[PDB]
Amino acid sequence: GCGELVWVGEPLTLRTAETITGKYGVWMRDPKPTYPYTQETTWRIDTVGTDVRQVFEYDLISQFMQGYPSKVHILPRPLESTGAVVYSGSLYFQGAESRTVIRYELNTETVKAEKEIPGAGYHGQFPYSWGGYTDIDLAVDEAGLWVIYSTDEAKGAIVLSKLNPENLELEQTWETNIRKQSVANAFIICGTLYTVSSYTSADATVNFAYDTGTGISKTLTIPFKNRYKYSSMIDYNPLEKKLFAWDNLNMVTYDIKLS
Numbered sequence: 001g002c003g004e005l006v007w008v009g010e011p012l013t014l015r016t017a018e019t020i021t022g023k024y025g026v027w028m029r030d031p032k033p034t035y036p037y038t039q040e041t042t043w044r045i046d047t048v049g050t051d052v053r054q055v056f057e058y059d060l061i062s063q064f065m066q067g068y069p070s071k072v073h074i075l076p077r078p079l080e081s082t083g084a085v086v087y088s089g090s091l092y093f094q095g096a097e098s099r100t101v102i103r104y105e106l107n108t109e110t111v112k113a114e115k116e117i118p119g120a121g122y123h124g125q126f127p128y129s130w131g132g133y134t135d136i137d138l139a140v141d142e143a144g145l146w147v148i149y150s151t152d153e154a155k156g157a158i159v160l161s162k163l164n165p166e167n168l169e170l171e172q173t174w175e176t177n178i179r180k181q182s183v184a185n186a187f188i189i190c191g192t193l194y195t196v197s198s199y200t201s202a203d204a205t206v207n208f209a210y211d212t213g214t215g216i217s218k219t220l221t222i223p224f225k226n227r228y229k230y231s232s233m234i235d236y237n238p239l240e241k242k243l244f245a246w247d248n249l250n251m252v253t254y255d256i257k258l259s
């Protein structure tokens with residue numbers, strides 16, 4: 001059931017970090033779970049600092065919400081910022097101080113692929129508006145794995161590329177007219193890129209769309225609430241058909257409706 005985004009619900013807080021290490025971070029579920037994981041498996045990365053390697057894994061939603069991790073993975077290389085995703089059994093993340101995306105297979109704790117995103121700015125060149133070295137933002141939608149970034153050639157405008165999830169080859173690339181540093185974050189639903197206007201406001205909006213199937217850009221005015229005034233991560237999960245976000249220590253989710 002695909003369509004255009006027409007509504008975002010109120011943010012629901014599922015867990016609150018208890019230390020400054022979790023002021024910003026990323027939390028996610030796999031929209032294509034593979035053994036031994038399930039649709040309930042949740043991963044959480046607290047991303048404050050300069051040597052971020054701990055990935056908290058929870059087998060059950062109850063554990064993610066109330067308990068300790070079931071397992072902690074120590075990444076073999078530090079991770080950059082909040083843009084990572086989990087897809088079909090692998091964590092896809094950006095290496096610290098690099099434009100390299102790394103595929104880390106969770107069940108074997110093995111790096112399976114690495115790829116420099118060609119021409120991508122990194123480490124504060126084309127972050128989202130809050131900073132945080134958010135230059136490179138991975139995304140999963142109904143069609144698979146994507147990466148959101150910018151390049152000098154694009155003059156800081158959002159570029160998005162479809163990625164091969166096995167070897168990280170770029171399969172197709174689109175260039176928008178949206179200055180990446182002018183929006184708070186972005187995500188992809190059914191092949192359409194959406195942006196959020198502000199990371200602090202209770203009265204933000206989903207303010208732009210770019211449809212990769214048609215090439216058409218639109219302006220939107222869909223209300224979006226940053227309940228805690230500092231959203232560092234906003235992603236879409238196509239299995240749950242919900243937004244997952246990290247807002248000033250709080251792991252939150254938003255329902256949506258599509259046309």
Ligand SMILES: [Ca+2]
Pocket residue numbers: 137138185186187233234235236
């Ligand atoms: Ca995002």
Ligand code: NA
Pocket residue numbers: 082083084085137138139234235
């Ligand atoms: Na992301």
